[PDB]
Amino acid sequence: MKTTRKGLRDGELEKDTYGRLTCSECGESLKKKNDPDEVFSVRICADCGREWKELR
């Protein structure tokens, strides 16, 4: 899954006051899904139709 570090530089994701990676295009905080195998957070945009890996 694409990493947030990349999306940010591209201008798709943005950091909030609480360091919450959300799609700057929508503004609304993305829905974080469970990650059993992944040891990090994952932000998926149901509006844009994409996913990003956020390292906490």
Side-chain angles (χ1 to χ4, degrees):
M1 54 268 298
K2 267 91 169 174
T3 33
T4 51
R5 187 85 63 71
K6 305 283 95 89
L8 290 155
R9 182 189 66 167
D10 286 44
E12 270 285 73
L13 288 157
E14 64 163 15
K15 288 170 83 272
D16 285 34
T17 45
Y18 278 121
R20 285 171 85 189
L21 275 300
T22 190
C23 194
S24 158
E25 315 301 288
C26 312
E28 71 176 31
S29 34
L30 311 185
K31 310 207 203 294
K32 315 110 88 177
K33 212 210 156 182
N34 313 96
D35 36 81
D37 288 58
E38 274 135 76
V39 300
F40 291 115
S41 272
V42 56
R43 300 277 200 289
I44 179 174
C45 212
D47 279 320
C48 285
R50 273 104 166 71
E51 303 149 15
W52 295 292
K53 204 197 276 204
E54 198 292 321
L55 310 155
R56 194 165 210 77

